[PDB]
Paper text:
The genome of pathogenic Leptospira interrogans serovars (Copenhageni and Lai) are predicted to have CRISPR-Cas of subtypes I-B and I-C. Cas2, one of the core Cas proteins, has a crucial role in adaptive defense against foreign nucleic acids. The Cas2 proteins (80–120 residues) are core metallonucleases found universally in all CRISPR-bearing taxa. In Leptospira, the CRISPR-Cas subtype I-C lacks the CRISPR array component and is thus considered an orphan CRISPR-Cas system. Unlike Cas2 from other organisms, the purified rLinCas2C and rLinCas2C_Lai exhibited metal-dependent DNase and metal-independent RNase activity.
The crystal structure of rLinCas2C obtained at the resolution of 2.60 Å revealed the protein is in apostate conformation and contains N- (1–71 amino acids) and C-terminal (72–90 amino acids) regions, with the former possessing a ferredoxin fold. The crystal structure of rLinCas2C encloses the signature N-terminal ferredoxin domain (βαββαβ). LinCas2C crystal is composed of a total of three α-helices (α1–α3) and five anti-parallel β-strands (β1–β5) for the Cas2 orthologs enlisted in Table 2. In rLinCas2C, upon dimerization, the buried surface area is 3,430 Å2, identified by PDBePISA. A total of 33 hydrogen bonds were formed between two protomers of LinCas2C as analyzed by Coot. The rLinCas2C dimer demonstrates that the β5 strand (6 residues) of one protomer bridges with the β4 strand (5 residues) of another protomer by 8–10 hydrogen bonds and several other residues enlisted in Supplementary Table S2. The crystal structure of rLinCas2C (dimeric form) indicates it is in a catalytically inactive conformational state as the distance between the conserved Asp8 residue of each protomer is 11.0 Å (as opposed to 6.5 Å in SsoCas2). The distance of 11.0 Å seems too far to coordinate a single Mg2+ ion of the protein. For these aspartates to bind a bridging metal, the rLinCas2C would need to undergo either a major conformational change of the β1 or ferredoxin fold region or altogether the dimer orientation. The mapping of the surface electrostatic potential of rLinCas2C demonstrated the presence of a positive charge at the putative nucleic acid substrate-binding loop (L1 and L2) and the α1 region. In LinCas2C, alanine replacement mutation of conserved residues Tyr7, Asp8, Arg33, and Phe39 and loop L2 abolishes DNase activity, whereas moderate reduction of RNase activity was evident in selected mutants.
Numbering used by the authors:
A (entry chain A), B (entry chain B): -1 to 87
The structure:
Amino acid sequence: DPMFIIVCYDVETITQEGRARLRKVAKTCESHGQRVQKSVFECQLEPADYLQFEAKLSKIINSKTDNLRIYSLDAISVSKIKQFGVSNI
Amino acid sequence: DPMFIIVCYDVETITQEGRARLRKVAKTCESHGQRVQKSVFECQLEPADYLQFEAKLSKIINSKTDNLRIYSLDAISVSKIKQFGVSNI
């Protein structure tokens, strides 16, 4: 029943403004899941809550600069997640 | 019949060696799909070819330094894939 969501956020983290945008997206995602890369998060949601969550992240980015890509997958979509190398940050 | 594959490669791009590792992953993924973000690619492969592909990416990375994450999905609707902002390289 619960949706599995991969959030991929490409934003510059040289400027304080850009670091703050990434911090804000991280903090939205981490109350529904886990940070797996600097800018990749895995979340679980009831489908009912999805749209509000999508709007929340959307509103945070600079749409003239940044890229946000969200995969909203059915539970059964995913057969295998394979990790390589090192797991911190 | 073929699997949908999200490749997420988190590598430092401060050193020439690190930029080169990202370039080499990109070039492997782009003969099987599309670069959709700086460090995210979408690929399609028949199962037999998956393992050889997974080994090829694995071999390229610094396993002590980089993070490579491969999602193996059953085929999804394009409607499950949401984008916001621009594609700026």
